[PDB]
Structures are given as C-alpha cells and as structure tokens.
Amino acid sequence: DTAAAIRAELAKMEPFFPSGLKIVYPYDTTPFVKISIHEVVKTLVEAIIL
Amino acid sequence: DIAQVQVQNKLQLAMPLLPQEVQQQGVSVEKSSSSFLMVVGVINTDGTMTQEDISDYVAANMKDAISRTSGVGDVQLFGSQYAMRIWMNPNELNKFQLTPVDVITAIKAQNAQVAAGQLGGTPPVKGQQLNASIIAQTRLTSTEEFGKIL
Amino acid sequence: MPNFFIDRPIFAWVIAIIIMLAGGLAILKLPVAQYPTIAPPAVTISASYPGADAKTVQDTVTQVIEQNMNGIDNLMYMSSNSDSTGTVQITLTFESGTDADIAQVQVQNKLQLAMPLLPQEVQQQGVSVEKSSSSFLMVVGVINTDGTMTQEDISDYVAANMKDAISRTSGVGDVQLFGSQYAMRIWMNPNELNKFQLTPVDVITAIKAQNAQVAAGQLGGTPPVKGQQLNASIIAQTRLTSTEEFGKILLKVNQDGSRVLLRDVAKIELGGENYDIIAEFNGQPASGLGIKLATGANALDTAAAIRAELAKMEPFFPSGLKIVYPYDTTPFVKISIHEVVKTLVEAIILVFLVMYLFLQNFRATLIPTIAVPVVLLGTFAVLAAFGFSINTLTMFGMVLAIGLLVDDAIVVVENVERVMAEEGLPPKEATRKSMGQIQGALVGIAMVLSAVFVPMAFFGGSTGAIYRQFSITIVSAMALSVLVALILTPALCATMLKPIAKGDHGEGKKGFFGWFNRMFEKSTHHYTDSVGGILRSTGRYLVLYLIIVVGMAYLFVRLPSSFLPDEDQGVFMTMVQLPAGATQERTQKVLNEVTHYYLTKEKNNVESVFAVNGFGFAGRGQNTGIAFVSLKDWADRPGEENKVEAITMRATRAFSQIKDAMVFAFNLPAIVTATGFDFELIDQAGLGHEKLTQARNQLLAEAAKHPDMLTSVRPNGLEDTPQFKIDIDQEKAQALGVSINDINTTLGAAWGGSYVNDFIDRGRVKKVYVMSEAKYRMLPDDIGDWYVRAADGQMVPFSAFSSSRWEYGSPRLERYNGLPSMEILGQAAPGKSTGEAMELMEQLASKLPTGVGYDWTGMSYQENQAPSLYAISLIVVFLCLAALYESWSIPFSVMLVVPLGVIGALLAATFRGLTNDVYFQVGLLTTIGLSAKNAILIVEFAKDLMDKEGKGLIEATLDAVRMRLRPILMTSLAFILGVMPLVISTGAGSGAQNAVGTGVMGGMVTATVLAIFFVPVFFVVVRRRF
Amino acid sequence: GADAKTVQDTVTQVIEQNMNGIDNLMYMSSNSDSTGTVQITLTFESGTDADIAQVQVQNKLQLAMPLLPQEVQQQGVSVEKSSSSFLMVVGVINTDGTMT
Amino acid sequence: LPTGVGYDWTGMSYQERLSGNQAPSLYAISLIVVFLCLAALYESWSIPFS
Amino acid sequence: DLGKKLLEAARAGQDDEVRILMANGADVNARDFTGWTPLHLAAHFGHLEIVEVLLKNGADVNAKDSLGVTPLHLAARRGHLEIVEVLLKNGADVNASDSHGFTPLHLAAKRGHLEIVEVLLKNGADVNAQDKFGKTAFDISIDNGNEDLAEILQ
User: Fold this and answer.
1) Membrane-spanning residues where (chain E)?
2) Who among F34, F143, F145 is closest to B144 (CB)?
3) Domain F1-154, CATH homologous superfamily name and number
4) What distance in Å separates residue B82's CA from the closest CA in chain A?
C-alpha cells in the first residue's frame, strides 16, 4: 500500500523534472511480495483444474 | 503511535539541556523499520546536472512530499541538499585583521528578515488615508548577494 | 417464530418490555447535536509574528514548519497562508476514520521539534495547534450599552471573569475568545527620545531589567550550619503590576541630577494585545465567546448549562454590561426534536383512525398503537450501541421509517382480520394461519430492504458520513420492525382480537360504517373488474410502462442537484471589500452604512448586526470586514418576502450603489460545505510569485471564454498591493558608528511593535508591548523623525543612512503541500455537472506555462461509487427474491415496481422546484422499499394460490390482488396524511421537511395508484414468458 | 526561584484554564510550592484508556506552553500517567562504614 | 460555613459517595430483570410474583 | 471611477480592456496613494503595448512618485529595454533624479542591465551624477562587482 502511495506521488512530480532527469528503481522488496502471492494463486487454479 | 508519543514526551524534557547547535540541527523521532523498503534512484541522462545538482533537486522537490506520505517512517537522502557555503580563507582573514567570528556576525546582520510594521497601521490616527506594509531587509538569494556583504 | 409466541404471549411481553427499557435507557444517555461529525479530521497550526509582512512570515515560519510535517500518519493534504497581519495558519487534513487525537499529537510533536528553528519573537508569542474541524454551538456576545468601556475593556473582563467559568461548565469542550485581555502599552515619542539621546533599544533594555522575576535563595537553607532555627525564603524583585510603576522605570540619569523616566518619553496605559480588529454590536463596542460542544455531550443540556452559569455570574457585571446571543444552534435542535415527536405522535393517531375506519373495532386498533412505539424505543437502543446520536440526520431518518413500521403492523393485524372474516376461525388458529401466509414474505422483505439501504452506508468521505446516518437508522428500525412483527404482534392478535363470523364484512350495519362497508366492498369489485380487463390487454400497458420509465429518465437528468437543502438559519453574512491601501477608518464608515441599512430598511426582520472590521474568510487586513446579521424569530418574519434569501438579494442589490467598495450579502452553508470546485494552482518549479500570478490570470481569462461550462471562476485570495521598501545603506551606517541591530530594532519596534516581557495585572500574567505613538508612525515622512544613537554618542536620523521606494508584494501568500499556490473557486454552468466543469478546468490548466501544476482540494477531492454500489445492491435484492420464491424469473415482477414510485417523486420535486438532494434520495429509497414490499406480498399470495390449491394464473392474481387491496390502501392513506404537515411546512428547518415531504408524498401516491394496477400485470407477463 | 503566588499566576492558572473539555474528566487537583514547582493531576472515570487520556491532556497543554515564562519552558513540562501510592521502597545501607 | 465556601469529595471518598448513590438503582433494575426472566421461562405473572 | 479600472488593467496587462477604457476616456492621469499612474504600472510590470497606447493618449511621461520616481526609473530598474526606448522617444527625462537622488542610470547599473545602460548613455545620461550617498554609476558598478559595466561607464 505504501509502495503504491510512493509511486503515485512520484508520478505527480515527473511532468516537472528538468530535462534529462529520470527516475530509476535499483532496489525494491515489493515486487517479490506481489509476484510471490500471484504464484500461489496460480497453483490454486491449476489445483482445481487438475 | 503511543510508544513514539511517550518517547518524545521525555525527549522534550532533555531538549533544553542539549547544545544550541544540536537543537538547530533538528532532533528527530522516527518509528520506522530498520531495513529499506525500496530505493528510488534519480539519474540525469543528459549532461546538464551533476551528482550534487541531482541530490539537491531531489531534496528540494521530492524528499518532502515522499517523507510526508502515510506509511513512510523514514526517508534517507543518498546525497545532500544545497546550502550557501562560505569557504573562508585564513591568510586573507589575518590580512584584514578579521576572524571567523566577525564573518559569522556580519552574515547574521546582513542576511536577515526583519519586521518593520506598516504605514498608517493600527491603531491609526484619526484621518489616515493610506495603509501599506513596510519592507526592511530580506534574506539573500544569490551567492553574489552574499559576496557584497560589508 | 410466530407459532412460538402465539402460545406464549407473556414471553413476547417480556421481550417488548426489555426492548422498551433498553430503549428508554438509551434515549436518556444518548448525545444530542444538530449534525454528526461529517468533515475529515483537520488540525490547524497557528502562529503570530508582531509587525511581520506576509513574505517574512512565510520565509521564516510557514516554510520551516512545513518542512517538518513529515512522519505523520494519514495525511491527505496540507494547506497554509501567510497574511500581512503577521499571522500564519497551516491546516492539515486527514483520512476519514482517523483518530483526531492521535493526529493532533503527531502534528504537535513534529512542531515542537521545529520550534528551535523559528524566529525568537515567534517563539515568545507561541505557536498554537488545535483541532479545526469542530463547530460552534453558539457565540456569546458581550456588549457595553453604557458606553463606559471600550472593546478592550469588555475583552479583558470576559477573559478574567467569564472565559474560565464557561469552560468549566458541563458540556462545553472548547471556548474561543473574540478579543484579547489587557496588555501593558508603551507608546514612545521619537521627539522626546532624541532629546535625551535615547532609542527604543534603551526603553526595551530598561523594561527587561526593571520588570522581571529575579530568583533568590533562602535563609538557613540546606545544607545549614547546625543550630539554625529558622528557614525562610528570600524574595527579590518581581514583575510589575501597575501602569504607574512602568512610568516610573528609570532610563537615564542626567549629569545635572534629574532623571528621565519611561513616563517622560512615552504614554503608559492598558490596551489590547492588538488593534487589527474592531468589533461592534448594533454600533456598540463588543466582544464575545465562541463556544464548542464537547464530544458525546448533550447540546440542549449544555446550552441551558451555559445560560445558567452566565446568569450565575450576572450580578458581578460592570455597569451597562449585557450579554447577547448573536449565534445559537440550540433552537434548531429543539424545533427538530419537537417536530419529530409531533410527527411520530400524529402518525399513531392517524393509524388509529384509518385502522378504526376499515376494521371498526378498538381491540384491533390497539395493536399497532403498541407495536410501533416498541420498535421506535428499540431502535434508539440500537443506535446507542453503534455509537450514534440524536441529530437532524437521524431524526429525519426515523420520520421516514415510520412508514415501514406502521406498515408491518397494519399488514399483520389486517391479515388476521381478513382471514377470520373469510372463514369461521377463532383468533388463535386464525393468527397461526395468517402468519403462516406472510412469515417467509416478512423475512425476505427484511433482506431486500437491507440490500437497498445498507450499500448506501458505504459511500466514502464526508458524503458517506451523511448517508451512514440515514441508512443505519432506517435499517435498524426496519430489522427491528420485522422482529416485532414475528413476536409481539402475532401474540397481540391471538389474544386481543375478538371472533368474527364468516361472511361478516359489516356490509349490513347501522349508519356510516354500514354504508362505508357496502361502499368499499363494492369498490373492491370495481377494482377487480378493472384488473380483470387490464389482464385481457397487457400489451397496451407494457407500452404505458415504458412511457413512465422514459419519462423517469428524462425528469431525472433535468433535476438540479445539491447536497443538502438550503435553510433559513435566522442569520446570514455580508462581505465587505475595500480597495488596496484602504484604511481601517474608511472600512468602518462602510460597515456603519451597512449596519444602518439593516436597522432601518429592515427593522422588521433584523435583530442585530455584528460588524467585525478587519476580518474575512479569504483574507484579512484593514481593508476587509464582515457583518454577521442576526434575524428575529421565524414567527416575526412571515412570508417568503421576509426570509433570508429574499432579504439577502434585496440587501445585495441595495449595497450596489456604494461606489466605495464591494459589498454583498449571502446565506451561510447548511452545514459548515458548498458546490463548485476547489482548484489549486501550484508552482511546481521555482517560478516565483509573479510568474504564478500570470499563470492564474491566464487561466481565469481562459475560463471566461466558457460561460456555458464555467461560471463564477474566481481567485480565493487577495490581490498584490503597493509596499514601502526601505533600503538601509550598510556602508554609511558603519561609517557613522551605527549598529544594524540598533537600526532594525528601533524601526521594528517603533513601527511594527515589539513584545517585551510579562507583568501581573490583578493576579493574571499579561504581555508588555512597546511601540511608537500613532502620530509618529503614519506616513513615509515620519521615518525621518526617528534617531539612532551611534558609538560617538550622537543621534543619527533615519534619513541619513537609508533610501525608499514603492514596490509590489502579496498581502496573503498561499501554499499547498509545501509548494507555492493560489486557490481558485468556481462552479459548473447551469445544466452541466461538476464532473464536466472539472474535466474542462484540467484541460485549460494543461496549456499553462511550463512548471505550473494543479490539484483538487476539499469537496473536489473525495469527489464515483453510486452505480457500483447499486449494482451490488440490485444484485443482492435479486438473489433474495430468488430464494424467497424459489425462482430465477419471478423476482422480476417485483423489481419492476421501482420506477412507479420514482416517477411520482420526480413529478412533485420538479413541480415544486426542489433539488435532488440527500433527503430526496433517501425519500426515494423508502418509497421504493415500501412499494416493493407491496409487490412481494401480492406476488407471494398469487404464487401460493397457484402452488397450493392449484389455481389458474389469472384466477390467483385476481384473488391475491383483492386480498391485498385494503392493507395497501390503509397504510398508504395513513402515510400520506401523516406527511402532509412536512410538505406545507414553512420556515424553521422547512428546507429539510419540504425535501422529505414532497419527495415522499408525490412518490407515495404514484407508487400505490399505479402499483395496484401494474404489479398484477408484471406477475402475469413474467409468468407467461418464463 | 519563585514563590507560590507567582508560580500560580504565571503557570498553574495558565495551564488550568485550558484543561477543560477533555473526555472523561472527573476532577482536577493542583498545587504550587514556594520552590517554584507546580503539579496538576487529572483523574478520569474508571475504564478510560489512559493512553488516550495522556494524549488529550498533552494536546490541551500545548496551548498553554507559549504563555508560560521562559524559565519554565526552558525547564520543561512533563505530562505523564501518574499514581499516588508506593508499591515498595528499596533501601540501601553501608555495613563496613566506608560509605557516608 | 460562610457563604462562598463550598466542598467536594475526592479519591477514596468520591468513589464512596458514588457507590452509595448507585446502590438503590442497582437493586431496582436487578429485581425487574429477575421478575421478567421468571415470567418468560414459566409463561406467567402469578408465579414470578410469588 | 473608470480611472481605477484602468490602473487594474494597466498593471494586469489587459490590452483589450485598456484600449476599451481609452475609447471611454478613463482618466489617463489617475493615481493611487503611491502616486503611481497607469503608465507607472505598465512600465514597471513591463507591458509595451500598453505603454504606447497610454502615451498616445496624453499621459505624462515624466509623472513623478510621492518619492519622486518616474516611469523611466521604473523601467530602468526592472529589465525592460524595449520600454526604455519607447519612453525616451516620447520625452522621458533621462536625468530625472529621485527624492534620494537616484537616476535611471543608477537603478540600471545597480541591477546590471548592460544593454539598458548603453541606451541611457547614448541619450545624454550623466556619468557624473550622485545619489544621496554620493555614489556614481561607476561607484555602483565597482562595488557591485560588475567588470563589464565598469568598462562601459569609463
């Protein structure tokens, strides 16, 4: 939720960055949380199918 | 929330006992985690901006809004915001018989924002016909302004 | 279960009594207010900088504070402004559901840690942090009709003799003083100061030394020498207490023996902390107390408590000191509560009449008289448990529920009667059979009405707070009605009802009742004949139905929307705007001219005029002002010609002739919030103030090119004004031996005013201000009168080391979320939606100079769910009827009654010229709910006859429709009559009554006249297709 | 270094006039020594969450902070949850008489 | 005592005054509840009164 | 008064309203407590079209402040070169001195504006002249630290 809030806030700033200024994402522990969960959901559907 | 409240309650009792240089540097009470959630890197693709320039832009246009969003306990800036740096010279100081003491004093007296009241301000005399704020000295805004300090 | 309490009447009585008691207890320990808390929690950081301009305050206070508002939880947005009155105000708004206490303590703490970074004088003054989302219960004016004391005189008295007492009174949570206690005032004289080679620096130094609390030790204090017999404290110098003592303060002792006292170079007197605002009540000097209601407290018990305390401190008032009540929300609550009890009472009397007119026996007419009150008291308990309170919202919430309560009572009683008359069954076994016909139906209805009302309590933000009151209130009453209709009512029938012979429809009986019965019994034939013919030509009526639906959609989108109906609150405001640089004296003349207009050309309607010179909701200063007009009672202002809107427009049109300023009257918001948008123009780079102003003007001019989309698009701030800049030449100053500190203090103190220290006045700590006398600090030509002592001991004029120039600056700088900004207000043009006028404003803003952003604040935020909620609602309703009937198709014949009730409401609303507000919308849901209830019963009976005695489709529908005629007719008759008083209500909270009245009556007539004919059609055509 | 009369006019009374309106206040007692120290105790109805009570009091207290003398603010003012009696008293003595 | 002088109880005494003033009511509401409960269980007004 | 609506338009930069007010004869010499005229405002806030329209309409090119300041003074201090030239062509006193002795040059050299300093010089502006302090165009440039402005004024 906080990661989403941070991204939303960053999005309101980009349209005003000086030329060349770019945002990059070197380190984030959020994607794993989301991706990991969806994988278990994936195995759920495959379970009921099997 | 309450753990933080109680901590600060006792901290406020210690504040007046701390050195002025420490107080004016701001004491903080975070209630965040120890590890990083994420790191928002900021780069410049052209050659317009240096590591210093980028850090200052982030600190002056991005840091606050982020450290102010709910969920964020602490925001560490991998850099530093600008400040008017006065790099003094010993030889040139001694030469004019001055010291860092005199320099700091001049900066306070000439880089000041004073309140000078108003014209026809309250309580006014009977028959006043105009009212406008009076403006005194204002904070310096450029390095060049700081150099002209007498 | 009915069969359980039919054999156990006493058990049912116990439950009825328990519910009553629990309810009675609740209706005594339950908070009472006009409105619940609807606005999001908001904290306001207030600070003051004596003599500071808008720019100085922002660059030393506002900005420093704003940078430290991090780490706080649940912030939605931050807002602030910095006036040229030396004031700053930072408002932080929070998510809904946020504990205001936790939010404020977090804001408070971050502020504390930032205190060391603020200017000295700003710290001395202090920084406030208060909850601003609160509303005033009343304001207590304190005037002096004797003309023997100034507004500063009144203020000091109120603060030292009244403020505390009122605060301690039961019910009051907070108290704001519309003024300031005394403060020692030193009015210096530059001509005299120079005569003795003195400056404001000297005057200050002497005051800080000869007016202070000097700490000393003790006699025989620890550690003592053994043998010490006494241990006394030592008292040193302590702070001064009188005006005379200050004047005696020693400044300089000449070399000729004589001394120079503070009295010799300045007038010493007690005045106010500030002179920015001057208040008057009907032309008389005045002050006041803004009183707020404590949480969970009773508004009525509090208003009475403060009036007692005031009367208890009355014999101590000085001569000519009387208290007035310019603003008071108490009457509204009394009127509201009284009109609710009234409505509930005359609703029981009407149900009694209609129950006796049709049934014609007292024992039966007695049942609803018990069932209804039980449910009412019961729901009060349910409200209490949830933590709600008696308020305008929840009050109307019940006066709309009585229709569903009376219904459930009438249906159970009438059905038992109808059964005994159609077969020789005694009450006991007739009640069992009767209940056995509607048991399932009544439960299903409870589900349906829940599905209809509960989703409404899921809207977010402020708007959700309002719907949540109605919804939960109505749902509780509804669920508690069915419960009583399955326990108490069935028991009261099998016990208090007398046997009625088969075929006995009172058709032959004496007099009226005998005639009425023959009349109605023959009308039930004429009615079933019509339905019989209708069912022979269903196609013709399917078409008429679509016409109704189409008409509904047309009449719906053509109906203007407002959030809550506008009311006549017995008070209204009038703004006053003078040109730039306009003095306080001029503003006063206009305010006198405004007050003179009300107490003359409106003497019949106006009670008083509270003229506040120097205040404004969107800007402060000498050139601004507000007039709080208080009207006479609603019983002294008959006709629309004497209501607020009529008086307001007539006042605004009259003040147009004033070529001195902009003056207009306007009614205040229903709840303290409006319509239009709250646009925020943001400097997202480093553009500055002038570049930002241009981007604003550019957008304001663009919005002026769309009078068909955007109307009244204006800035919500102040315009730039000429300022007097002084340039102190650093060189010539150091060349004359004059300290910059000496210069900026003699100037800052003499012209701006400086707060020096504290003194005790009659046992109370008060401030000491030093400042030039008025005549020596008015014009730019006075600056030369001020001298500053140099090192050599000579006095040097200001006109020796400085220059001057006229400049432009802002009197009020705004900020949003830490960046510079300017607020822009507007509304959608007539006919267009806010969601369209907003979309346009975004487009115009996208074409603005690079580095200029925008955002929405307030109402425009917390701005989207309706269809989504009533799609889930619509589904749940369907699934319920599906289970009740064991059919995927039949539910449709019930859901088709929706438009029948709506169309009527739209007719009434449009005809009378009302709006599509919350009262109207809730009125719809109850109408829809009731009309739906009718369909469910008519369908249940018809379907039952087909499944049980295997009757034909038309045969069953005609028999079912016949059995339901009387019940439906009765509840509708008793309903319409009981709502009449609301529809015609005028004055005093009518705006609300008229909304819940016209919307319901119109919809209730159309929902029964059309339903009794259309629902038999729905059932048939649906049963034919599926 | 302030007597009881002064420490009440510049501190106690200043703080008290603001402590009105808080949720669940039963009563409020206070005292002002000649050593210059004050103490204001607020008791709340039984069942009240003491953590919220401390916060609410601290919120009202911040209003009065500014009006307090410099010597008092520099001193610090503490708002804590309190109790009247002692759970126990731990004593300490020296047995070989080497410590005064 | 002279006019202008009032009194009040605190702490242990405050709780004592309270405990005493709530007592009568407490007994009343308790008798009512017991009576009603009996009436419901045995479906009667006569035997719960006995 | 239409004169006021003119001061608002002249400051705001609304040429359309200003021209309209011209049609209607709104006082071109209107003033406010500071003494600033619509030409003062337009010169200060830099709109040319207004300045010309105002000058075409009989406005006092040498209108003075309560502090003695003029439109050239305003235009020179602020940055508008285009305004400076137009004002000079219409008879603006190039050597107009303030109540404090400041002339259009001083305000120009004070803030730099090399391009504007040249224009003022080729119109007969004194080098010589002293402000209340006794600084001269050169004294102001040297102290300020402008080497480029030092050569021009030498």
Assistant:
1) 22-38
2) F145
3) Ankyrin repeat-containing domain (1.25.40.20)
4) 17
